[PDB]
Amino acid sequence: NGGITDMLVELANFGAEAKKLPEKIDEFLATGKLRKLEKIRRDDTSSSINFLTRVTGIGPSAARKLVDEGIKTLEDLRKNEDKLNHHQRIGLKYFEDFEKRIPREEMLQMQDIVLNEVKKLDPEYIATVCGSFRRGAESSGDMDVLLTHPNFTSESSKQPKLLHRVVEQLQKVRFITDTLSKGETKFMGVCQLPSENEYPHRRIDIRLIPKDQYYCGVLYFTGSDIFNKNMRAHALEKGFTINEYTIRPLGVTGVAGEPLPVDSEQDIFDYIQWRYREPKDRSE
Numbered sequence: 534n535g536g537i538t539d540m541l542v543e544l545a546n547f548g549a550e551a552k553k554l555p556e557k558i559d560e561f562l563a564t565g566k567l568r569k570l571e572k573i574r575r576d577d578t579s580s581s582i583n584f585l586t587r588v589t590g591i592g593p594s595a596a597r598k599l600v601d602e603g604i605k606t607l608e609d610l611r612k613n614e615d616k617l618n619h620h621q622r623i624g625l626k627y628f629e630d631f632e633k634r635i636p637r638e639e640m641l642q643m644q645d646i647v648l649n650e651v652k653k654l655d656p657e658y659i660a661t662v663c664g665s666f667r668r669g670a671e672s673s674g675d676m677d678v679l680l681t682h683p684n685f686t687s688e689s690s691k692q693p694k695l696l697h698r699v700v701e702q703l704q705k706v707r708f709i710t711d712t713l714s715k716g717e718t719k720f721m722g723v724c725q726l727p728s729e730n731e732y733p734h735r736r737i738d739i740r741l742i743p744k745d746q747y748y749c750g751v752l753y754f755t756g757s758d759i760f761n762k763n764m765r766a767h768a769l770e771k772g773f774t775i776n777e778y779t780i781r782p783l784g785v786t787g788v789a790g791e792p793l794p795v796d797s798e799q800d801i802f803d804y805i806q807w808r809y810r811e812p813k814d815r816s817e
């Protein structure tokens with residue numbers, strides 16, 4: 534029966550009473566589940582792994598041994614402080630708040646303060662929060678401001694202090710509450726707007742780019758993927774390759790190139806002829 538064909542599909546996942554012995558019931562159709570397999574229970578230990586990654590900083594290597602450190606839960610780690618760095622220390626301490634998307638109300642808010650801070654700093658800067666909020670969206674998960682200055686480019690490749698100047702600052706103001714890393718061309722960290730009678734902290738990463746590699750790197754973080762995936766294409770279609778870093782005329786056999794200069798966003802869109810496909814509509 535259709536009836537006996539189903540418990541069937543359930544076992545494999547997991548003469549008549551002979552191929553049988555070759556246990557079962559309506560017990561398969563019913564479901565044991567995770568418990569039924571309890572292999573599956575060891576499989577859920579894979580729920581350790583990915584859950585464990587959920588914690589900040591910890592990447593492939595990290596959790597695996599950590600969990601391996603007999604460990605697997607919120608609280609394992611909570612005890613297991615010693616077992617990680619300043620990074621991951623945080624993305625635990627916060628992590629929870631970490632799984633709660635912001636409100637573009639606040640965005641604009643920091644959106645302000647950020648660019649508001651820089652502006653206090655110098656005029657030659659230019660910053661821009663990008664990623665999602667840009668696209669219009671009601672909900673991000675990480676701030677992401679992109680900076681640059683004329684006194685800097687892909688040629689100098691040496692000006693940490695620059696990017697450094699503002700990080701210091703955003704902290705000054707008590708905004709950037711903590712800090713994951715730091716390494717000249719990149720900052721990633723934890724902010725938080727201001728009070729008076731408290732909001733959760735949000736992941737930000739300040740980047741910087743030569744005032745040249747700027748733009749391309751710009752289009753790229755506004756994504757999406759697919760979006761930046763549908764585009765790499767067409768340009769290539771029309772024979773052009775692009776990357777996080779830049780626009781390049783192709784080649785005879787694939788390998789070939791050279792960076793065209795790049796004033797604004799729309800200049801590339803010019804390159805592979807397409808319409809200035811505004812952010813909002815930048816989904817695919």
Ligand SMILES: Nc1ncnc2c1ncn2[C@H]1C[C@H](O)[C@@H](COP(=O)(O)OP(=O)(O)OP(=O)(O)O)O1
Nearest residue numbers: 586587589634664665666670672673674675676736
């Ligand atoms: N820790 C992470 N590891 C890998 N990919 C991540 C991680 N966090 C986010 N992503 C990727 C996959 C998510 O679907 C996407 C969204 O990240 P998020 O920081 O939230 O950006 P975003 O919220 O503005 O967009 P969305 O979340 O929609 O994808 O980014």
